[PDB]
Design a protein around this ligand. Structure first.
Ligand SMILES: COc1ccc(-c2nc3ccccc3c(=O)[nH]2)cc1
Ligand SMILES: [Zn+2]
Length: 208
């Protein structure tokens, strides 16, 4: 039941999503190994993901979490990169979309930095790169990321360099404790706590 609606580049909604994508690029400690070498993107398309059943699943869980946390869902808009982007937009997030070996346990991981999520587009560690050229820094092939509505509720704070949430919590927050420029990363342990609201198609751009 998913339909994708193209946003016009003239639409304020396109423009605000693009700005969040571009403005949250950073350099990575791997020198570009996983995600490629770039400072910015060429945004090719932004689509709204519309699915009534998946939305209702999200808002149902959101209300449950809100009621467990003094009427505060603690909702964020966060990036998600995954080889399973097509399955997610049609079927919703679930246990098959978890990062089993993640540092905060087996859960579904999201990032404030779009460039962190870009590292996962072709798999963990960038896998073998793009299917066509086997290049993790491919400047030709089209990539996709999701910009997602995520319910954090009461989040367990981990200071740092599917499973269950820690008791009495609805998510985990990975706070960077070494790299002063890194933004936070987040993990949820229930697929119903995220909705894949925007599908963004893009290329990474070669620095000049
Ligand atoms: C095996 O399938 C996987 C594995 C890892 C990820 C993933 N991990 C992240 C970790 C930190 C921040 C963002 C992300 C992120 O956006 N995606 C997605 C699918
Ligand atoms: Zn390629």
């Amino acid at each position: 039941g998913t339909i994708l609606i193209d946003l016009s580049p003239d639409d304020k909604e396109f423009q605000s999503v693009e700005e969040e994508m571009q403005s949250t690029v950073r350099e990575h400690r791997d020198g570009g190994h996983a995600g490629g070498i770039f400072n910015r993107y060429n945004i090719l398309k932004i689509q709204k993901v519309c699915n009534k059943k998946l939305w209702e699943r999200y808002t149902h869980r959101r209300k449950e979490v809100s009621e467990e946390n003094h009427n505060h869902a603690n909702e964020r808009m966060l990036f998600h990169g995954s080889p399973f982007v097509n399955a997610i937009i049609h079927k919703g997030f679930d246990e098959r979309h978890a990062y089993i070996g993640g540092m905060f346990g087996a859960g579904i991981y999201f990032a404030e930095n779009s460039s962190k999520s870009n590292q996962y587009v072709y798999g963990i560690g960038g896998g073998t790169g793009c299917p066509v050229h086997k290049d993790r820094s491919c400047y030709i092939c089209h990539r996709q990321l999701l910009f997602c509505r995520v319910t954090l509720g009461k989040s367990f704070l981990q200071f740092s360099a599917m499973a269950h949430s820690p008791p009495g919590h609805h998510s985990v927050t990975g706070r960077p404790s070494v790299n002063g420029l890194a933004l936070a990363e987040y993990v949820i342990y229930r697929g119903e706590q995220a909705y894949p609201e925007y599908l963004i198609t893009y290329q990474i751009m070669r620095p000049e």
